[PDB]
Design a protein around this ligand. Sequence first.
Ligand SMILES: *[B@@]1([O])O[C][C]([C][O])O1
Length: 261
Amino acid sequence: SAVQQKLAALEKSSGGRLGVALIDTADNTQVLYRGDERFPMCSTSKVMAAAAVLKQSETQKQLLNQPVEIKPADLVNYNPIAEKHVNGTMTLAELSAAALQYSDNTAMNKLIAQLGGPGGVTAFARAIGDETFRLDRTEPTLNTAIPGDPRDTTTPRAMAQTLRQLTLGHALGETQRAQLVTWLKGNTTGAASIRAGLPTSWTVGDKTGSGDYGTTNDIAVIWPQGRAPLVLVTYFTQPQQNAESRRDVLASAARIIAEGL
Ligand SMILES: *[B@@]1([O])O[C][C]([C][O])O1
């Protein structure tokens, strides 16, 4: 289609490898570009860790208010929020919000620990029918994004379907789902990515990701004003280990998708 031609041309212009999956919940149609290829998730994996804890809170009604101690040893490479609470505590809700809205790596590692390790995050994926998602490492090493390395990867198709279920479907309880949507809508790191390719009137909840090999990711739920919502996943990675982030590519891919709806 016209859109796949333009996405292919965008990819060629960028020098990297682009993965796109759009789900139009209006008619359940899908637009895929390298939709079944594996990409490093980087911090887009934090959505799965947060959703897994949310699922736990369906039975442990007070779980999200459980305080968790932040020790100096817990601090890794990027902890904008956890930094503010060293030698203090953060609730599991505050850590979930920090992981999603500020991409705090210490917060993500606490969520993984709460779930019993990376295997616990991956287990949740399988429980909701995602057989592609795999989380193998903790922060920060899950961002190495080595070409061909299957660790800590998923496919755009798989992530789009799963994000739909978590935010628009009923993989989570009603209150948990709404909390996840609220967190995603208040993301602070996505202004230059998918959001930048879309009309300013559209409401967007997203989670960005970045890592080595210039890996630049964004996954988003989109609520156009007066229209069925959309799920859009954009994954991008490059052949040089030290390549710069290319959020402009994500914005351009979203703009190309928006043209047509
Ligand atoms: B994720 O990918 O988003 C930011 C941090 C950087 O290490 O991880």
